[PDB]
Structure formats: C-alpha cells, structure tokens
DNA sequence: ACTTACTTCGTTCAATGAATTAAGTAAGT
DNA sequence: ACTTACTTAATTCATTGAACGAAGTAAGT
C-alpha cells in the first residue's frame, strides 16, 4: 500500500469521501452540521455536495425547522445508489442477501447444498444466485459480492487456504467468481471478521471505537477492532486465537496441534470431554440447569476456560471492550458470570482501567450483513492509498 | 486520530515528506530516480527540492556515471541537520545518548542513581543531562528527547501511569521535562517498543515488514509489527502479552495478577521456583537467582539450575508458539541480555514453537535472534523522535 | 506609503472600519441607516456587526420608535472598549491624561520636573506615569500612548530630532518607551499637530473639512487641514511656517536662521524688541516681557507695551494673510494662550488678513478663534492613537 | 468617499496597480511584476489576461534565457488611445495630440487674440480638437486637457478669472462638454500642468517630493508631496506668487499691494523700471555688459526670488525645488544668489539639505503636462467615488 | 544525433472567504 | 395586508498556491 501522490485529485477525493461518510453515518444531515464537524466553509460544501449529488450518491431531503431564518434542506444519503450481494457458505447450505448501501437486507434466500469436497459446484451455485437475485434489478447497480466462510483465507488473493468444515483446500474463490463478474469486486473473509464489521457499523461500533468480538460455537473466533480497524497479521492473514495452546499434550485439534483453546472453551469441549466419560450445547445447557452432574461440570469448566481465554484477549490486545457472540448457540446460556468473574480481573483493571465484557445486541442476520459490509467498507474508504 | 482536511498544505506535506524519506532511506539518490519512483515531473521535484535545500535538510552530492546523457547530481540527506538526545531509565542508572538523524550514536554516557520512588529527582537529573549531552552544540538543533522506560505509559499525555520496577505512579514525565525544554517534543514509551522501533529502522525492518519482537531477560516483553506499524491497543495503550495468564492460581506477579507468563518465561521464574526448589536439591551450587548465575550453574551440570533453566525455556517456547498463533507475525525475533545464554533455550523454543497453527497449514514462521547490539535500546528511544518527525503528517 | 494588495483581507477591513466609524461618529445608529448609508444588504451588515460585537467594540442599544415598522434596534459604539494615555512635555512640567475612545478626559494630572537637557530622566518619569495613570484598570485595555511635544519630530521613527525649548537632540522617544510597553503603539507629534487633531475631531472639524490652525503665545504654530487631512511635507516631516523669513537680517531665532515670523508674531517679539526699547521708554511701567504682563501694561495705556503689542499684532496679521494666500484654507482658526488677550490683536489681524488674494477674487476666508478649551492639547495627543487605530488601513 | 469593499474593488486595485508598473517601465517581465507587487504568477495569469483582453497591454518580445524558458515581455499599449491637450495663451492657442505616455504625436498653433472673446476661443478649441482627430478614430480620444493662466475652479472646470485674457467666470468645461459629452475635460493652471510633466517625465523619475517654481510674468508654485500635488480647499490651488512681501508695496493685478511676484518675477522690471527697455532678456544682457540699472534689477530680483524660495522650503518642506523659466531662460537668473539665500533654511539648519535646481525639461512640457491632466486621471487606482 | 538532466516561465483547478442572493421569521402599523 | 427589521441558508467569484505543462538550456555519449 503506497500513499498516493499529493495533488488535486487526492484533495477532491479526500473531502468528498469524508463528507460522504458523515452523511452515511447520519443518514440525513444539514450542510451546517457537516461544516462544523468537518471544518469546512459552506462555499467549499457547495462544490463537494454538488459533485456528490451529480454522481447520484446523495439526494435532496426534507426542509428542516426554521431557526431564524431560511429553512435548511437535509442532505440525504442515497442508500439505493446501488446494492450488494452477500453470501454465507455453510456445511448444509448457501445463504444469500441482497442489501442496500446501509447493509439493510432487501432480499434473502437459502439454497441447500452439500458443499463438502465439491467447491467447483458450490462456486457455480453461488454465481447462479448472484445473477438471480439481480433478476428484477439493474446489474450495473451491483457494486460487489461479499462472502463469509468458515476457514483460513488468503485475503491478498481471495483464496480459501483451508476449510476443515467444508473439506476445501486452496480454492481460488475470488478468481472463479471474477470469471463471472469481471467488473465487480469479490471479497472473502472468515465469519468472525464479517460479524465484527456488522458490530462496527450496526452494533457496538456506534458507541465504541475499540472492542474485541469473540464468537463461541463449534470453535472460538476472535476479531479485534482498534480505532475502527480490524487487526490482521502478515499479508492480511488473520490471527487465530482459538488455536492458541492452553494445554500441552491436550485434546487433539483439527488444526494439527494439541491443546488448543477452542478444544476447551467452545462446544468442541463437550464432544471431547464427553467421550472420556447427548453432547450438543443446548441439551447440555438444559441438563445442567436440571442439575445433571456431568452437564454441570461441562458447562462449568467450559465457562472457566472461556474466562481465561477472554482474560488473555484483554491482556494481549488491550481492547477496552469484549463482545461475546453465540455462533450456533445462545450466548445467554453460557456461564457468563464466571467468564466475567475471571476476565474482569486482568492486567488493565489492576492498573485502574476497567474492561467491560458484554454480549452482542445483534441478531443472526448480522453474519450476512457483515459479509455485505466487506464490500461497503471498501467502497466508502477514503482512497489515500494505491 | 483523524485524517486532515484535503487541501494544499496537506499535499505539500505529502510530497516533500515522501521525497525527503526516499532520500533518507537511500542516503543518496538522483533527481531522476526520485522523479521515477515518485511519479513526478522534473519541475515539480525542482520546487520540492529547493524548499528542502533551503531548510538545509538535504545537500548537493557528487555526480554519477553517465547513462546517455548528462551526468546526474546526487541529492544527499543531511544527517546532521539536527540531533536527538535519548534516555533509558533503569532502577540503578540513567543512560544517555546523543544521536544523528539516522539514529547513530555520537556520544553516550551513563550515571549511577537510584530512581526507585524518586521521580522528581530522576527527572531533574535527566533534564541537566540532556543539557550536558548537547555540550558545545546549538540548542536550536536539538530536535527532541526520547525516553525508554520499564512500565505502563500514556503515550498521549506522556505520563508514566505506573512502573512497578521503579515504584513510580502517575508521573507527568513529558510535562516536567517541558518545564525545562518548552520548545521541543519529548516522547516516552516502553523499553520493548523502543527496541522494536530500532529493529524497524536499523535491523530486521530493513528487509521485512512484519515481525514480532520478544525480549527475554529480567522480564518478557512483546511488540508486534504488521506492515511496518507497531501494534498498540485502545487509546494507544500497549498490549501486555507478558501478563497473560499461563497458570491459573500461579505465582503472584508485580502486576497484581497471578500466573502471568512473565513469572514463568523470564528471570522472575528462577526466583519464584528457586525458593520452592532449595530443599529438594540441598547439595546444589546455586548461590544466586539472577539469569547469568543460573546459566553458569546449569551449564556446569547442577541438577537444580538445569531444571530451572530448561523449564523457563519450555514456558518461553509455549509463549512464542502463542505469539505466532495469535498475531501471525511471519517472523519472531528474540532479543535481550538473555540471548547471552541462547545455547540453553533456543533449541527448546524452536522445538515447541515451530509446531503452530500456521505451520499445520503450510506456512512456516521463522524464529531467529536480533542482529542489533545493546545500544539499540537507546537508539530506539532516539527513534521515537525521529519516527515522529519524518512521518508523513496525514493525521491531525 | 503604498496601497495594500487587493484581496479579501483588504475589503474586510474597508467594510468593518467604515461601519465602525459610522457608529463611532453617530454614537448610536440603527442597522437600516448603516445599510442605507453604506450600500450594504442586511445580511452583509449582519456578519460585519457580529464580528464587531464579538470583539466588544459595539454594543446593543435601545429600540427606536416604529416607522410602520418593526422597532429597529440601535447599535452603540463602546467608548470604553479600551483607553488611551496622553502626555504633553513642557520645560517645567509633564502633563498626563487618560481618555476614553472619544478622547474624553477621564483623569488628568501634572507634575513639576525640568526636562531641559534631561530626556532619559523625563522618559523614565513618563513611563512610570503612564503605568500610574492606568491605576486599577487592566493594562491589556491600554490601546496606546500619544505625546505632544515642542520640537522637530521624525514621526516614522518616533524620535525627537531636536527640541530647542527642551535642549533635546536625537532622542529615540518611542523606542525608549517601547522598552517599557513593547506591545502598545506610542506616537509623538508637535503640539500644533496634536491640537489640530483635536480641532478635526472635537471642534471645527465637526462642521468643516478645511481649516488652518494657528497657535499664538510663546511661539507661532501652523497646521493646515485640507479634506480632513493634516498637511505634512517630505517623509512626513512637518512644514514650519513659523520659521519663514519676514525680515532678512532680523532677530536671531532659536532655529539658527535670522528674521523668522515667530520672532515677530509671538511672545518672542516682546523679548527681542523689548531689549531695544527699554531706553526709549525709561518711564514705562513694564517690568517683565511675558505675554500676559505686556498685555496688562498695554491695556493700562503704557506707551512701550502698546507699541510692542500693536506691532506683534500687525506682524501676526501679515503672517495670517500669507497663510491664506499660500494654502487657501477656507477658514483660519486662531488658538492658544494668547487668546486670553485677544481684544488687543484680533481687530488688527482681521484688518490686514481679510484683504487677501482670494477676497480680491470674491472668496472670503473666515478668521475666527477656537471653541476648544486648554485640555485640547492633551486630547490631541490622545487622538494620535485614536486616529491611527480607527483609520481604514488601506496603506502599509 | 471610499468605495465599498467587494470583488470589483479587488479587481480594479490589482489591475490598475499592475497596469501602472507596466506604464512606468514601458515593458516588463511577469516575474518583475510578481516581485514588485507581491503577486503569485497565477494571479498575474488572470490580471494580465483581463488587461490584454481590454487591449491596454500587448505581447512584447522575448528576453534572454536564464535557464530556462524565455520570458515574453508585457508591453504597455501607449496607443490604446490618445489625448488632446490645449494651452491657452494671449496670442495663441497651442494644441497637441499625445499618446498615453504624453509623447507628442501631432502639434499645432492657432493664432488668436483671446482677450475678451471667451465663447469664440472655446469654439476654436472645439473645432481644432475635432480636427486633431482627422486621421484617427474619435472614440480613441480619451480626454482633453487644458492649461491656462489664471484662477481655476477645478470642482466645476470653470476659469474664475484670468487677468491675462480678461476672462471672468468662464464655464470652459461646461462649454466643451456640449461638444464632447463622453469625453472628460480638465482645466488647470500652467504651473500645475508643468508639475505633472516633471512628475512623469522629469524630476519625478527620481523623486517623490519637490516644489516647482515658475519664474516669468508672475511666479507660480506647485508643491508635490508623495507624488501628489498640493491643492487647497475644494481643490482650489494656493497662490504663493501673491503672498505679501512688502506692505504698501507695488500694486498687483490681484488687487493686493506688495505681492511676491511684483518683486521676484519679470513684473519687478516693469515696476522698478518706471520708477527710474525692461523685458527680461534685454535686462539680463545689459546686466552682463555692466549697465548699472540692469545689474541692480537683476541683483534685487535674485535676492527677492531667493527669499521667496527659502520660504517655500520652510513652509512646505518639499526636499527639493525645481526652477522653471516661463517665457525666459532660467539659467540667466541670479541662480547662485537664489541658492545662497534659500539653501540656508530651517531644515538645513537641522541637518536636512534641500537641493535647489533647474528643470531638465523643455517647452513642450507645458502641453505634455496638460495632456497628463487626463492621463493621471485615467490611470489613477479607482479606490474612491 | 541522440540522450539524458535540469531550469525557468507561465497555466489550471480546488479550496477559501468575502460579499451577496434566496427565502424565511419577527413584530410592529 | 402592508411595512419594516432582522436571520439564517446557501451561492458566486478573485485570489491563492500546489502540481503541472510549455519550452527552453546544459552537458554529456
Ligand atoms: Zn487448533
Ligand atoms: Zn503480570
Ligand atoms: Zn526660526
Ligand atoms: Zn498679487
């Protein structure tokens, strides 16, 4: 990523994208609020807003109440300038959503398919629905495709390095969709990252710039947001906190290591510990509340493991806030008090800074909205790099 | 941390700082090569270079070999445009260095003084030493002061929130030094971040853009660099991997928690475990629990010191394996006075840490040791000032 | 010296100073009358008036009676936005005044002190007095210091080149005072120019734009105003009509020349001619040669005093006739100490001076006396600051 | 009244200022304009475009390269228009058609006894003005400038009185305006017109301050301070020639007794002569030949002129005095005496010397000066209304 | 002759900030 | 229903200063 040369195009783009983003955030806003918050004289907004309206990305809104005074006319973000299609690839099915530029779902469908070991066919099935959801619309307005998957992703290339869930290896997902949509960006990322984009744009991100998102289900996912940016490692390759070692020589994990955190702090623990003594999360939780000794032990220890996992996310990253999301299970059923009891005693609370641990305020559609946000985030990012 | 308004001042800064940096990294370069690398027409570069030469930060170099073609004149970075003073605060001494703008040490000195619970005294002594390090030079050429410290730092306010090692609490370091030097920037950061900065500019960073820096010795420090940027959490507050819990209900750490990685993967382990092992190995020759002493007794064959040293290596290995799984840093660079005894732990670290999530998927993470000497801690502190002064000021 | 560049800062100043002066001139006026007079739309005036009110130099006044008609609100000049200190330097005393922005005297005092050949002592005493004159007020509201002096002045540099009456030679008055008050303008001008400013702002200037001001007393001073501007010659150096030669090879004057008008048309003449007459009138009751004493004995019927007074009135008349023929001032205002005994010379002045070039062509030049009192010299000095502060800054 | 502050005022200030620098130099590079007027080259892009669009400047020749694309000189169009100047004398009416530099293109003299025939004189002016433009487009005529001997009301353009011509209350401008309603017409005294010539073509090329003193049949004085001529109330000029130097002295034509010009001008010869040929040239020559009466007249006129000039220096502080002969050769005056007397003054006594010298200009300057009445108005920065 | 390197002169365009138009409210007769 | 007096919203245009383009010189192979 090299910084763009300093010139007039860079000046125009910076001011138009910044003003545009404030308008997105508010939905509607007066020229005067934009001026105060972005430090622009009204005459500069004359040219910026004129260009944006000419593109069709903003619209004239309603007249505001008079305070003197000529009545101001609201500047409205055109959420329908275009649309996005998002896809979520699951074991049993392919979920789809056509969304507006606010990531609000307009249409959604589900196509059942056995995606395990047949990526070629899954891609073609994706390409088909993408074309079908735009069947009663103009495909010029299709601004991109966003894909959420469970696995390891090379974001530099848009390839799925590995997906244990689906039995995929080195699938050039983006390359294959690009043959069907050459002018349309196609982005793939892991589920936890798509969900985190949903929190950033629709959830916790509306009041915080820093938080960590922890998904607990069949595995444990972690995505850290610092200053409204998600942390990725080298070459854009995401870190894998779920596969940190907590017990040397412990349960054999599907990643090839022994003793991974997610083998103790996720639903996998029930499967593992179960065999050593039904183990689906919801049944185990019910049985626990009913006082079954085995079910209470599993829920209790998973809660302890999760607690130490979350404490270490806090100590390692200094996220300020941790959001727990259930992935295929209801997080309110977790031993939340234990998790909080353990993780709230950390390095930073010891020094006078509390870190709040809470649960998501978003619903299931957020996974798909997040996948769409992969595209929207890219479209509205101030283009200072090349 | 917000983007500046798009205007002529912004683009003027983007271009002149980008050109300046290109000249600075190459030491010497021609106008044609700058123009080609930066996509400028010659007239554009002409004006940018005039401003820089008039400031005195670049100088005319010698001519180069012909390629056609008139002989192009090199443009040279004036490494002596100004100078920097760096400081490293330790329990029993204060270290000082005066560097050029490439962070090369021109002078350095150290003094005995106990800063333990004596912040006003230490700070007054540091101010006098900054003045003395300038010697006969022009004070107007002092570009800043950079300070490496062991503790918890608020980089925004320049305050040391806490340093358990020094017994300091809520010390307005930057502000107190601004009372003596009002017209110059003064920055403070953790020791590990200073060293990483030195690594970024003078070591591993010259050839790679991603790496984790792990200091082993009297403690355990971690800093991660991704795409030439050091990771910091919320509000610019550093992460604290050394204070991750590896053993619930384990050794009490100076941070208030129990079972921190630092209590098992550093010198602290020898004192914690040593107390427990004394009666189990009565014949042992270990008189002291400092790193160098434990290394000598283990390398001599003492059963207790080999257990202590080998166990510390194991815990360190698992710590590094978890650095890899968590951050995906591409490479891990081990650092610190603990390397003086690398022969005793590097093999165990490599055995444990080479098996990780990423190696399971076909990506090997190199684990190596630093190629920088001990002065890098001081150079790193100097680079706090240099990094900040040469950074393209895109943010306001 | 030259006109400012045409840009937004210039037009901003032209408009806000023009509106400010309109308000200041009228004391209180409405937005509508300003807009009417200055040809502005109401929105334009709204912004100009916001700036002025925010600075605190105009205030919101009371409502005006309806014209049919929402009630228009008066805009008032804040005469107390700041204050000014003025000084008058005499041989035997230093006079001080503190004035509001209408040049109205709030306070004034005087002190005995011999400034003769003692500029440094006098200037130190003036500086301590400026400080004391401020009293309980905020020094930040002292807009300046204006000084009236008898002598030759370089107004650019603020230096007294020469003052024969004080024995001062190349005294950097303004620079020496700037040592005490660096952020405050300090102006110096001759007594006659100070009084003329007072006349321009508080007296004759309220009704007319052209007049010559002539001071009679212990000297003769002239200042000419045409189109509300005081005439100055080359480099801003004042003209010196009092030092015109009326009698070749005549009385030696303090300026180095012989026969100057001032040696015949002022008190100086009583001393020069008095010396030559003593023996021709031994019986005469006239002891002293000061103005009032000569007037007393002449009004009592003394042959010597009547001759001295009659002649000086005659020479004064010819001096004024030539002021008229030379400048075409439209009006001549007589001023000074000497007015106390106007009954003895005003008739002769009128007889001689009313017959002039312009009266011969049908244009009569009115010759009158000032309607201002003694404090006008101090007010004039204060007006050096006020004039300069409220002047539309079109030059630089 | 100052003009309101707005964009038109901004435009005019910068265009007129840049235009004036170009007139001063004849030709100049855009870079010198930029450095002299503190403008960025891009601001000049628009200023020079507007001025070229008007046809008041032209593209000049290229300049020697210094690196370096060659700069193209920006040239003042002295022929954008022309001016007609008139000088009203006792025996004749002189005329000149000049370019915008006041350089004489065409000139003529129309013999006429203007004494007591004002309407007629004005009709000859209007006709010759109309004829001077016989071979040139009339809309290029930018104004008419008239130099006259006498008293002038400049607010109205009327000749209040001219003793030379026996005119009284003649509405010169009003009468010419009937023939040239779109053309400005300016009237002023000869001395003021000559001073404009000095200011643009002579002493004004090296000085911002000077007094011009004409010595002929009468004594004229015009004072320039900071490149502006001093006028009295309502623009009515002062009359230093009619200051009293001798109470009950020679009866002057202004109605006063003892005026300076009755002693320090050629009138002194006529006056003193009768009390004992008195034309200046004959008296000067007779004096050089040792005639006792002629030497006395020349000696005393010199002393009187000397005291007159000393008092101009003392009154006005002009920095320098320029002596001009009007109908006579100034070099024939007792210049050393004038200098001896006048150089001892108030200001030289205080360390500031005042140079007294003679004009470097020739006779056509009177007419060039009258044309400059119009030119000075056209090129003045319109900051007022 | 060709190439490469550097310079200086002069233009374009986005932002800026002053007046100014656009379109109301505010409060009387 | 008028009339006059204020307010706030949003636009125009001359200047500005950054890159950029025009059109040369400079000094080699
Ligand atoms: Zn695993
Ligand atoms: Zn700890
Ligand atoms: Zn004198
Ligand atoms: Zn006369």
Automatic annotation (TrEMBL), chain A:
SUPFAM superfamilies: Actin-like ATPase domain, Winged helix' DNA-binding domain. Belongs to the ROK (NagC/XylR) family. InterPro entries: ATPase_NBD (IPR043129), ROK (IPR000600), WH-like_DNA-bd_sf (IPR036388), WH_DNA-bd_sf (IPR036390). GO terms for molecular function: metal ion binding. It comes from the Bacteria. Transcriptional repressor of xylose-utilizing enzymes. The lineage of its organism: Bacteria, Bacillati, Bacillota, Bacilli, Bacillales. The keyword Cell membrane does not apply. It comes from Listeria monocytogenes serovar 1/2a (strain ATCC BAA-679 / EGD-e). Transmembrane segments: none annotated. Gene3D superfamilies: 3.30.420.40, Winged helix-like DNA-binding domain superfamily/Winged helix DNA-binding domain. Keywords: Carbohydrate metabolism, Metal-binding, Xylose metabolism, Zinc. GO terms for biological process: D-xylose metabolic process. Zn(2+) binds at residues 243, 253, 255, 260. Pfam families: HTH_24, ROK. This is Lmo0178 protein.
């Amino acid at each position: 990523d090299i910084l763009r040369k300093g010139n007039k195009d860079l000046i125009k783009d910076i001011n138009r994208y910044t003003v545009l983003n404030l308008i997105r955030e508010k939905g509607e806003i007066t020229r005067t609020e934009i001026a105060k918050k972005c430090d622009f004289g009204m005459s500069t907004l004359t040219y910026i807003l004129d260009d944006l309206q000419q593109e069709g990305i903003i619209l004239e809104g309603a007249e505001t109440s008079s305070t003197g005074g000529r009545r101001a006319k609201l500047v409205r973000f055109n959420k329908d300038y275009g649309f996005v299609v998002s896809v979520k690839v699951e074991e049993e099915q392919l979920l789809f959503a056509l969304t507006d530029l606010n990531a609000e779902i307009i249409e959604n469908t589900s196509i059942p398919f056995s995606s395990e070991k047949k990526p070629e066919e899954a891609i073609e099935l994706i390409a088909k629905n993408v074309k079908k959801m735009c069947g009663n619309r103009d495909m010029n307005h299709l601004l991109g495709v966003g894909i959420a998957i469970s696995g390891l992703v090379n974001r530099k290339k848009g390839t799925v390095i590995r997906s244990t869930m689906l039995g995929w290896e080195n699938v050039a997902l983006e390359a294959m969709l690009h043959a069907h949509f050459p002018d349309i960006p196609v982005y793939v990322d892991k589920n936890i990252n798509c969900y985190t984009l949903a929190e950033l744009w629709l959830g916790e991100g509306k009041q915080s710039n820093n938080f960590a998102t922890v998904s607990v289900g069949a595995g444990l996912g972690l995505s850290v947001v610092i200053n409204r940016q998600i942390y990725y490692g080298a070459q854009g390759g995401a870190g894998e906190f779920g596969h940190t070692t907590i017990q040397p020589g412990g349960y054999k994990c599907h990643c090839g290591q022994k003793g991974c955190l997610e083998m103790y702090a996720s639903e996998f623990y029930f499967r593992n510990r179960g065999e050593e003594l039904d183990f689906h999360f919801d049944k185990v939780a019910k049985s626990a509340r009913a006082g079954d000794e085995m079910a209470t032990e599993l829920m209790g220890k998973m809660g302890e493991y999760l607690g130490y996992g979350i404490r270490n996310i806090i100590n390692t990253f200094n996220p300020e806030k941790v959001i727990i999301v259930g992935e295929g299970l209801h997080h309110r059923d977790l031993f939340l008090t234990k998790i909080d009891e353990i993780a709230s005693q950390n390095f930073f609370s010891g020094a006078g800074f509390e870190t709040e641990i809470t649960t998501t305020s978003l619903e299931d559609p957020a996974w798909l909205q997040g996948a769409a946000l992969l595209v929207i985030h890219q479209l509205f990012q101030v283009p200072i790099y090349e």
